[PDB]
Amino acid sequence: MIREERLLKVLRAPHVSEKASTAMEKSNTIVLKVAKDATKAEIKAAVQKLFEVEVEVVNTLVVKGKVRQMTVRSGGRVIRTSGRRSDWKKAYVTLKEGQNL
Amino acid sequence: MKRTFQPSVLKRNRSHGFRARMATKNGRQVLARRRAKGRARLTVSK
Amino acid sequence: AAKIRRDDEVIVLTGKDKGKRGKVKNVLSSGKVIVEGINLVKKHQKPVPALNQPGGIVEKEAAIQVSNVAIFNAATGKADRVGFRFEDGKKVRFFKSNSETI
Protein backbone atom coordinates (compact mmCIF):
# COMPACT_ATOMS: atom_id res chain seq x y z
CA MET A 1 0.00 0.00 0.00
CA ILE A 2 1.12 3.55 -0.72
CA ARG A 3 2.38 5.42 2.33
CA GLU A 4 0.86 8.77 3.18
CA GLU A 5 4.06 10.79 2.71
CA ARG A 6 4.23 9.65 -0.91
CA LEU A 7 0.64 10.80 -1.40
CA LEU A 8 1.41 14.18 0.13
CA LYS A 9 4.24 14.47 -2.38
CA VAL A 10 2.66 13.42 -5.67
CA LEU A 11 0.06 16.21 -6.11
CA ARG A 12 1.51 19.53 -7.26
CA ALA A 13 -1.25 21.91 -8.33
CA PRO A 14 -4.59 22.20 -10.09
CA HIS A 15 -4.13 23.05 -13.74
CA VAL A 16 -6.12 26.04 -14.98
CA SER A 17 -7.12 26.35 -18.63
CA GLU A 18 -10.27 26.41 -20.70
CA LYS A 19 -9.67 22.80 -21.70
CA ALA A 20 -9.55 21.98 -17.99
CA SER A 21 -12.69 23.99 -17.22
CA THR A 22 -14.58 22.39 -20.10
CA ALA A 23 -13.43 18.97 -18.93
CA MET A 24 -14.67 19.65 -15.41
CA GLU A 25 -18.03 20.95 -16.55
CA LYS A 26 -18.59 18.25 -19.22
CA SER A 27 -17.06 15.01 -17.98
CA ASN A 28 -16.57 15.61 -14.24
CA THR A 29 -12.82 15.49 -14.88
CA ILE A 30 -10.16 17.22 -12.78
CA VAL A 31 -6.85 18.26 -14.36
CA LEU A 32 -3.80 18.42 -12.09
CA LYS A 33 -0.09 18.88 -12.22
CA VAL A 34 1.55 15.86 -10.62
CA ALA A 35 5.06 14.73 -9.84
CA LYS A 36 6.79 13.61 -13.01
CA ASP A 37 7.32 10.12 -11.53
CA ALA A 38 3.81 9.60 -10.13
CA THR A 39 1.97 6.53 -11.37
CA LYS A 40 -1.76 6.34 -12.00
CA ALA A 41 -2.28 4.26 -8.87
CA GLU A 42 -0.44 6.88 -6.81
CA ILE A 43 -2.52 9.70 -8.28
CA LYS A 44 -5.72 7.75 -7.66
CA ALA A 45 -4.82 7.13 -4.02
CA ALA A 46 -3.69 10.72 -3.49
CA VAL A 47 -6.89 12.25 -4.85
CA GLN A 48 -9.09 9.75 -3.03
CA LYS A 49 -7.38 10.53 0.27
CA LEU A 50 -6.43 14.21 0.20
CA PHE A 51 -9.52 15.45 -1.64
CA GLU A 52 -12.07 12.99 -0.18
CA VAL A 53 -13.66 12.18 -3.53
CA GLU A 54 -14.20 8.86 -5.29
CA VAL A 55 -12.15 8.45 -8.46
CA GLU A 56 -13.19 6.60 -11.60
CA VAL A 57 -9.99 6.52 -13.67
CA VAL A 58 -6.78 8.50 -14.22
CA ASN A 59 -5.27 9.47 -17.57
CA THR A 60 -1.77 10.93 -17.67
CA LEU A 61 0.56 12.62 -20.13
CA VAL A 62 4.01 14.19 -19.99
CA VAL A 63 4.44 17.76 -21.23
CA LYS A 64 7.83 18.59 -22.69
CA GLY A 65 9.10 21.98 -21.65
CA LYS A 66 9.85 24.72 -24.12
CA VAL A 67 13.00 26.73 -24.69
CA ARG A 68 12.80 30.08 -22.92
CA GLN A 69 15.15 32.94 -23.74
CA MET A 70 15.85 35.95 -21.58
CA THR A 71 18.77 38.14 -20.62
CA VAL A 72 20.83 38.32 -17.46
CA ARG A 73 23.19 41.19 -16.68
CA SER A 74 26.58 40.11 -15.31
CA GLY A 75 28.86 42.98 -14.38
CA GLY A 76 27.42 45.92 -16.28
CA ARG A 77 26.80 43.78 -19.36
CA VAL A 78 23.64 42.10 -20.64
CA ILE A 79 24.13 38.58 -21.98
CA ARG A 80 21.48 36.50 -23.71
CA THR A 81 20.75 33.14 -22.11
CA SER A 82 18.79 30.13 -23.31
CA GLY A 83 17.45 27.09 -21.52
CA ARG A 84 14.62 24.61 -21.42
CA ARG A 85 11.73 24.66 -18.98
CA SER A 86 11.36 21.46 -17.01
CA ASP A 87 9.00 18.69 -18.05
CA TRP A 88 5.92 18.00 -15.97
CA LYS A 89 3.16 15.42 -15.80
CA LYS A 90 -0.52 16.21 -16.32
CA ALA A 91 -3.27 14.02 -14.88
CA TYR A 92 -6.86 13.84 -16.12
CA VAL A 93 -8.74 12.53 -13.08
CA THR A 94 -12.32 11.39 -13.65
CA LEU A 95 -14.52 11.57 -10.57
CA LYS A 96 -17.39 9.19 -9.99
CA GLU A 97 -20.01 11.63 -8.65
CA GLY A 98 -18.26 13.90 -6.15
CA GLN A 99 -17.82 17.65 -6.33
CA ASN A 100 -14.33 19.11 -6.00
CA LEU A 101 -12.94 22.61 -5.52
CA MET B 1 21.43 14.27 -55.30
CA LYS B 2 22.12 12.02 -52.34
CA ARG B 3 24.46 13.67 -49.84
CA THR B 4 26.80 11.91 -47.46
CA PHE B 5 24.91 12.54 -44.21
CA GLN B 6 21.92 10.20 -44.02
CA PRO B 7 20.94 10.39 -40.36
CA SER B 8 19.83 7.47 -38.21
CA VAL B 9 19.77 7.74 -34.42
CA LEU B 10 20.34 4.02 -33.83
CA LYS B 11 23.41 3.91 -36.08
CA ARG B 12 24.67 7.15 -34.55
CA ASN B 13 24.51 5.77 -31.02
CA ARG B 14 25.91 2.38 -31.98
CA SER B 15 28.88 3.99 -33.68
CA HIS B 16 29.81 7.03 -31.59
CA GLY B 17 27.70 6.70 -28.45
CA PHE B 18 28.85 6.62 -24.86
CA ARG B 19 28.63 2.85 -24.42
CA ALA B 20 30.51 2.41 -27.69
CA ARG B 21 33.30 4.69 -26.49
CA MET B 22 33.49 2.83 -23.18
CA ALA B 23 33.76 -0.60 -24.80
CA THR B 24 37.41 -0.30 -25.90
CA LYS B 25 40.42 1.34 -24.30
CA ASN B 26 41.01 3.54 -27.34
CA GLY B 27 37.45 4.80 -27.07
CA ARG B 28 38.03 5.26 -23.35
CA GLN B 29 41.07 7.33 -24.29
CA VAL B 30 38.91 9.48 -26.54
CA LEU B 31 36.72 10.25 -23.53
CA ALA B 32 39.70 11.11 -21.34
CA ARG B 33 41.01 13.61 -23.89
CA ARG B 34 37.60 15.25 -24.11
CA ARG B 35 37.36 15.47 -20.33
CA ALA B 36 40.82 17.03 -20.25
CA LYS B 37 39.79 19.61 -22.84
CA GLY B 38 36.67 20.32 -20.81
CA ARG B 39 34.14 19.61 -23.55
CA ALA B 40 30.54 20.32 -22.61
CA ARG B 41 29.33 17.35 -24.70
CA LEU B 42 31.41 14.22 -24.22
CA THR B 43 29.71 12.15 -26.93
CA VAL B 44 26.87 12.22 -29.43
CA SER B 45 24.68 10.63 -26.76
CA LYS B 46 21.63 12.78 -26.15
CA ALA C 1 33.76 45.91 14.15
CA ALA C 2 31.89 48.34 11.88
CA LYS C 3 32.35 51.81 13.49
CA ILE C 4 29.08 53.09 11.88
CA ARG C 5 25.68 51.65 12.84
CA ARG C 6 22.08 52.80 12.22
CA ASP C 7 21.31 55.58 14.76
CA ASP C 8 24.74 57.27 14.49
CA GLU C 9 24.93 61.03 14.23
CA VAL C 10 27.64 61.56 11.63
CA ILE C 11 29.23 64.57 9.98
CA VAL C 12 30.14 64.59 6.30
CA LEU C 13 33.85 65.01 5.64
CA THR C 14 33.99 65.43 1.85
CA GLY C 15 31.79 66.01 -1.14
CA LYS C 16 29.68 69.20 -1.36
CA ASP C 17 28.08 68.40 2.00
CA LYS C 18 31.03 69.09 4.29
CA GLY C 19 29.91 69.98 7.78
CA LYS C 20 26.35 68.76 7.34
CA ARG C 21 25.15 66.27 9.93
CA GLY C 22 22.52 63.58 9.93
CA LYS C 23 21.55 60.15 11.15
CA VAL C 24 22.55 57.01 9.29
CA LYS C 25 19.52 55.22 7.87
CA ASN C 26 21.06 52.20 6.16
CA VAL C 27 24.51 50.64 6.02
CA LEU C 28 24.97 49.03 2.63
CA SER C 29 27.31 46.05 2.34
CA SER C 30 29.34 47.87 -0.34
CA GLY C 31 30.83 50.22 2.24
CA LYS C 32 28.25 52.96 1.69
CA VAL C 33 25.65 54.58 3.93
CA ILE C 34 22.40 56.47 3.58
CA VAL C 35 22.45 59.52 5.83
CA GLU C 36 19.28 61.50 6.53
CA GLY C 37 18.83 64.26 3.98
CA ILE C 38 22.37 64.92 2.81
CA ASN C 39 23.24 63.33 -0.55
CA LEU C 40 20.06 64.42 -2.27
CA VAL C 41 19.49 63.50 -5.92
CA LYS C 42 16.61 64.35 -8.23
CA LYS C 43 15.07 61.14 -9.55
CA HIS C 44 13.01 61.35 -12.74
CA GLN C 45 10.42 58.83 -11.61
CA LYS C 46 8.77 57.13 -14.56
CA PRO C 47 4.95 56.52 -14.14
CA VAL C 48 3.88 53.01 -13.00
CA PRO C 49 0.10 52.85 -12.22
CA ALA C 50 0.37 49.20 -11.03
CA LEU C 51 2.02 50.19 -7.70
CA ASN C 52 3.15 53.87 -7.83
CA GLN C 53 1.60 56.90 -9.63
CA PRO C 54 2.51 59.40 -12.50
CA GLY C 55 5.92 59.65 -10.76
CA GLY C 56 7.22 63.18 -11.23
CA ILE C 57 10.62 64.35 -10.06
CA VAL C 58 11.42 63.19 -6.53
CA GLU C 59 14.30 63.82 -4.13
CA LYS C 60 16.06 60.91 -2.45
CA GLU C 61 19.21 60.38 -0.45
CA ALA C 62 21.93 58.67 -2.46
CA ALA C 63 24.45 56.41 -0.79
CA ILE C 64 27.73 57.97 0.32
CA GLN C 65 31.01 56.27 1.18
CA VAL C 66 31.54 55.39 4.84
CA SER C 67 35.06 56.79 4.55
CA ASN C 68 33.40 60.12 3.71
CA VAL C 69 31.62 60.52 7.07
CA ALA C 70 32.78 60.64 10.67
CA ILE C 71 31.04 59.96 13.95
CA PHE C 72 30.02 63.22 15.59
CA ASN C 73 31.25 63.70 19.14
CA ALA C 74 28.60 66.28 20.12
CA ALA C 75 30.66 66.97 23.25
CA THR C 76 33.61 68.59 21.50
CA GLY C 77 31.29 69.42 18.61
CA LYS C 78 33.68 68.02 16.01
CA ALA C 79 34.25 64.95 13.89
CA ASP C 80 36.02 62.10 15.61
CA ARG C 81 37.67 58.76 15.06
CA VAL C 82 36.45 55.69 16.91
CA GLY C 83 38.39 52.81 18.44
CA PHE C 84 37.42 49.54 20.07
CA ARG C 85 38.02 48.28 23.59
CA PHE C 86 36.63 45.71 26.01
CA GLU C 87 34.57 46.56 29.09
CA ASP C 88 33.07 43.72 31.14
CA GLY C 89 33.85 41.29 28.35
CA LYS C 90 31.96 43.38 25.80
CA LYS C 91 33.42 45.13 22.78
CA VAL C 92 32.52 48.82 22.78
CA ARG C 93 33.38 51.88 20.73
CA PHE C 94 34.94 55.00 22.19
CA PHE C 95 35.90 58.38 20.81
CA LYS C 96 39.62 58.45 20.17
CA SER C 97 40.05 62.14 20.98
CA ASN C 98 38.08 61.81 24.21
CA SER C 99 38.46 58.16 25.32
CA GLU C 100 34.75 58.15 26.24
CA THR C 101 32.51 55.23 25.31
CA ILE C 102 29.89 55.77 22.63
Binding site: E4, E5, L8, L11, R12, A13, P14, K33, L101 | - | -
Partner: protein, 61 residues
Protein backbone atom coordinates in the same frame (compact mmCIF):
# COMPACT_ATOMS: atom_id res chain seq x y z
CA UNK D 1 13.17 25.05 17.45
CA UNK D 2 15.55 22.09 17.59
CA UNK D 3 15.64 22.16 21.39
CA UNK D 4 12.07 21.25 22.31
CA UNK D 5 12.03 19.04 19.24
CA UNK D 6 14.93 17.16 20.80
CA UNK D 7 12.90 16.89 24.01
CA UNK D 8 10.23 14.86 22.12
CA UNK D 9 10.39 11.08 21.44
CA UNK D 10 10.55 9.13 18.11
CA UNK D 11 6.75 8.54 17.94
CA UNK D 12 6.02 12.25 18.72
CA UNK D 13 8.61 13.25 16.06
CA UNK D 14 6.77 11.08 13.51
CA UNK D 15 3.44 12.71 14.35
CA UNK D 16 5.05 16.14 13.99
CA UNK D 17 6.56 15.16 10.65
CA UNK D 18 3.21 13.98 9.33
CA UNK D 19 1.51 17.18 10.48
CA UNK D 20 4.20 19.28 8.82
CA UNK D 21 3.82 17.33 5.59
CA UNK D 22 0.07 17.94 5.56
CA UNK D 23 0.67 21.62 6.30
CA UNK D 24 3.15 21.76 3.42
CA UNK D 25 0.62 20.20 1.06
CA UNK D 26 -2.08 22.65 2.11
CA UNK D 27 0.27 25.60 1.63
CA UNK D 28 1.27 24.31 -1.80
CA UNK D 29 -2.37 24.09 -2.86
CA UNK D 30 -3.02 27.60 -1.52
CA UNK D 31 -0.03 29.03 -3.37
CA UNK D 32 -1.06 27.36 -6.61
CA UNK D 33 -4.65 28.58 -6.35
CA UNK D 34 -3.56 32.22 -6.06
CA UNK D 35 -4.08 32.57 -2.29
CA UNK D 36 -1.23 32.64 0.24
CA UNK D 37 -0.24 36.26 0.47
CA UNK D 38 2.28 35.05 3.08
CA UNK D 39 4.78 33.44 0.74
CA UNK D 40 7.38 33.11 3.50
CA UNK D 41 5.54 30.19 5.10
CA UNK D 42 6.67 27.75 2.40
CA UNK D 43 10.36 28.02 3.27
CA UNK D 44 9.47 27.93 6.96
CA UNK D 45 7.65 24.61 6.70
CA UNK D 46 10.35 23.20 4.37
CA UNK D 47 13.08 23.95 6.98
CA UNK D 48 10.86 22.61 9.79
CA UNK D 49 10.49 19.29 7.98
CA UNK D 50 14.24 19.13 7.42
CA UNK D 51 14.84 19.80 11.12
CA UNK D 52 12.37 17.15 12.23
CA UNK D 53 13.87 14.39 10.15
CA UNK D 54 17.39 15.44 11.10
CA UNK D 55 16.36 14.87 14.70
CA UNK D 56 14.69 11.60 13.72
CA UNK D 57 17.82 10.33 12.00
CA UNK D 58 19.98 11.28 14.97
CA UNK D 59 17.63 9.54 17.42
CA UNK D 60 18.04 6.26 15.52
CA UNK D 61 21.55 5.82 16.86
Amino acid sequence: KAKELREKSVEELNTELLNLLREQFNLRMQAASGQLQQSHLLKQVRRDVARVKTLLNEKAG
